[PDB]
Amino acid sequence: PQITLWQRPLVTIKIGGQLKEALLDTGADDTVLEEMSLPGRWKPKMIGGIGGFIKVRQYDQILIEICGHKAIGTVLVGPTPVNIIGRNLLTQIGMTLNF
Amino acid sequence: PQITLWQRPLVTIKIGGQLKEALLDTGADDTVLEEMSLPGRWKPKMIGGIGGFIKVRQYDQILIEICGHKAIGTVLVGPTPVNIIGRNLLTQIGMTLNF
Ligand SMILES: COc1ccc(S(=O)(=O)N(CC(C)C)C[C@@H](O)[C@H](Cc2ccccc2)NC(=O)O[C@H]2CO[C@H]3OCC[C@H]32)cc1
């Protein structure tokens, strides 16, 4: 389907048994979610944007359900003001920008 | 046209008669550009990003071309890691997300 941009493109994702509201963000290289528990090993990382940098934990190979698809990707967990779905996951579900 | 997301959706924009590279950002409500000179008066605006809040200069009804499409709208100028084209202008050029 087609998703208009008059409003923030929000979607409900399923991850780690939890439901979260997230933003389909083409400007985000990676997916960044608010503090939560995830299985497996992680590496500390620093990501920057408007306002500066925030420290996050990088988890790889995480299963995420979004827009009916079941995708695998890296998830960065940290003090982000909003849950963001980055390009690393958007590509997996075949999402593109059209005009 | 269609733009995939395997790489950053960087496009050429034209503002003030000069070409610049900007990021098509669906996760951004507004368009924020790096320091530059724009005509007329500006109003103050506070925007919050991933690392916190920053002060930006708000210019209205500014002529700006994105991917060759002409738009006239609000442009914010301030300390941003990269030029970002937000939904306020993405909607003016008929940009949508599809999957
Ligand atoms: C490495 O992985 C990364 C993932 C995400 C980011 S990032 O979040 O700083 N970024 C990138 C953008 C600032 C270039 C995504 C932007 O679209 C970012 C996502 C976001 C962050 C906080 C709150 C709302 C929305 N949008 C953003 O900064 O938008 C600015 C400009 O318009 C306003 O909308 C609300 C916030 C304001 C950085 C790195």
Side-chain angles (χ1 to χ4, degrees):
Chain A
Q2 184 171 88
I3 299 176
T4 167
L5 299 173
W6 289 116
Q7 287 80 53
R8 299 186 182 211
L10 297 177
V11 294
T12 302
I13 67 171
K14 299 83 194 306
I15 178 176
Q18 301 170 47
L19 288 178
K20 286 191 178 300
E21 187 95 316
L23 182 64
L24 296 176
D25 196 347
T26 60
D29 296 339
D30 291 286
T31 288
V32 195
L33 302 177
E34 62 207 345
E35 282 299 334
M36 74 179 288
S37 184
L38 284 183
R41 61 233 64 84
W42 55 267
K43 301 146 295 303
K45 185 184 171 75
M46 281 281 273
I47 56 170
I50 281 176
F53 290 74
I54 62 164
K55 178 195 175 68
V56 300
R57 303 193 312 282
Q58 177 185 349
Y59 291 90
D60 301 320
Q61 307 312 90
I62 299 292
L63 171 64
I64 303 179
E65 285 191 278
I66 172 179
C67 295
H69 296 57
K70 205 175 270 58
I72 303 296
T74 294
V75 181
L76 307 182
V77 180
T80 175
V82 61
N83 293 327
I84 291 164
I85 303 302
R87 295 185 296 103
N88 89 280
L89 202 74
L90 296 181
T91 60
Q92 301 305 93
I93 64 180
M95 194 162 285
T96 62
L97 239 18
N98 299 263
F99 64 114
Chain B
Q2 178 174 94
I3 300 177
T4 61
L5 301 169
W6 301 100
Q7 285 201 294
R8 274 184 270 234
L10 298 169
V11 298
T12 300
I13 63 168
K14 197 208 307 193
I15 182 171
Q18 61 203 173
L19 302 178
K20 297 172 184 294
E21 285 291 284
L23 183 67
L24 299 182
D25 200 343
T26 59
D29 299 336
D30 317 301
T31 295
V32 191
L33 306 182
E34 304 161 19
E35 188 57 54
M36 69 173 291
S37 294
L38 283 178
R41 290 181 60 81
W42 59 272
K43 292 155 67 283
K45 190 181 175 72
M46 269 282 276
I47 61 171
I50 211 168
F53 295 77
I54 67 166
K55 288 302 299 171
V56 297
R57 310 199 305 277
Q58 179 181 326
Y59 295 87
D60 300 313
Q61 288 177 239
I62 296 297
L63 285 286
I64 179 172
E65 210 169 285
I66 303 153
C67 297
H69 297 237
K70 306 194 205 305
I72 305 174
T74 299
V75 171
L76 310 178
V77 182
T80 177
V82 63
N83 293 320
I84 57 181
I85 308 307
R87 298 185 298 98
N88 71 302
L89 298 183
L90 296 179
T91 54
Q92 289 203 22
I93 65 183
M95 185 91 55
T96 59
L97 280 166
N98 303 262
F99 72 100

